[PDB]
Amino acid sequence: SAQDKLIKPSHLITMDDIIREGNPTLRAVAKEVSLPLCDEDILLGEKMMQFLKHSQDPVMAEKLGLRAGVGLAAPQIDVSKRIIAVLVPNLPDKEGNPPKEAYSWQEVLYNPKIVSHSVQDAALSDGEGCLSVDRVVEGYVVRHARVTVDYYDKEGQQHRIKLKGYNAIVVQHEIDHINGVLFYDRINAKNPFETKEELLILDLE
Ligand SMILES: CCCCC[C@H](CC(=O)NO)C(=O)N[C@H](C(=O)N1CCC[C@H]1CO)C(C)C
Numbered sequence: 732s733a734q735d736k737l738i739k740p741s742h743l744i745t746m747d748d749i750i751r752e753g754n755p756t757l758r759a760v761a762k763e764v765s766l767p768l769c770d771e772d773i774l775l776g777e778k779m780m781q782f783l784k785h786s787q788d789p790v791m792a793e794k795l796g797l798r799a800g801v802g803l804a805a806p807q808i809d810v811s812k813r814i815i816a817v818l819v820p821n822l823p824d825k826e827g828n829p830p831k832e833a834y835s836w837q838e839v840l841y842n843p844k845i846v847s848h849s850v851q852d853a854a855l856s857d858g859e860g861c862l863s864v865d866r867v868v869e870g871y872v873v874r875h876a877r878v879t880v881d882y883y884d885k886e887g888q889q890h891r892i893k894l895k896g897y898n899a900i901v902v903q904h905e906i907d908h909i910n911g912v913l914f915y916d917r918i919n920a921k922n923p924f925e926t927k928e929e930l931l932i933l934d935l936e
């Protein structure tokens with residue numbers, strides 16, 4: 732299967748492993764992962780985290796021809812399992828200094844689930860992109876401004892976390908993937924940049 736090839740020790744995930752719009756796997760509902768976590772799944776998660784790290788390494792990304800990404804879900808690499816990886820980076824300050832800490836959030840979540848959320852919604856002012864989608868769909872991708880997520884880490888320990896801002900946006904984008912949902916599904920087709928008081932607009936800069 733695909734996962735088998737992906738977990739090969741010397742295998743590096745590249746755009747060649749990312750299925751695109753059209754493959755039915757993107758629209759399927761990923762299956763939960765068995766507990767305790769089996770080797771295959773844990774290794775896949777690490778491969779996913781490593782992919783993200785490589786994508787955010789300007790030289791490496793440039794060498795491998797990768798698109799900088801801040802998250803990835805198993806289905807995107809043709810594995811219909813509820814496994815997602817997030818790597819949300821901090822940005823430089825107003826003065827131009829590099830962030831004190833490269834990442835704001837780094838985690839591989841297994842069987843993640845949204846338990847509660849804010850009444851307010853939120854969308855990145857610049858819209859969203861997806862490496863599984865080879866085209867641009869402009870508009871505000873409407874998501875919950877804040878969410879509480881329950882998931883199991885690679886150790887197999889259950890966690891419950893409160894996310895907001897950029898972290899909340901990224902996690903929902905990834906969770907959408909394991910439910911067969913693509914970002915443009917959350918863009919108001921009749922008015923892509925529709926706004927409402929309850930809709931917070933996030934500027935990353
Ligand atoms: C924001 C919600 C999470 C996005 C995750 C995607 C990666 C992905 O395809 N996950 O499934 C990404 O990094 N997309 C990028 C993206 O949309 N970004 C990167 C910075 C913030 C935002 C731009 O508005 C594009 C540039 C490839």
Ligand SMILES: [Co+2]
Nearest residue numbers: 860861862863
């Ligand atoms: Co995506």
